[PDB]
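Sample intake sheet
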Amino acid sequence: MDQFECINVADAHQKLQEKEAVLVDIRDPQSFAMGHAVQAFHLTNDTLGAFMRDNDFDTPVMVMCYHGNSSKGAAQYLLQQGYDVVYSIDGGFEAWQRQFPAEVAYGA
């Protein structure tokens, strides 16, 4: 579709558990390594080319950032590239870690 949607972390977690959507994290690499959601792919302009080759445009994509702000612009960017089902995760990593502290991974 031609718009992206904002979702909360409980919704995102459920989609992930059901294997319905993939999760990308657009934060800087240092913050990513300090802690990220399990199964998050670190998506940057450099890793985008690989991401696109590896995830067809019909793949639902959920975008996480620091707080839920930059993920909106990144989600819109992905729609513009051809993705049809894109979400921005309200609250970002802060919300993820608060709700799901046992589902945090470290490093790359």
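Comment: The radius of gyration is 12 Å. The chain has five helices and seven strands.
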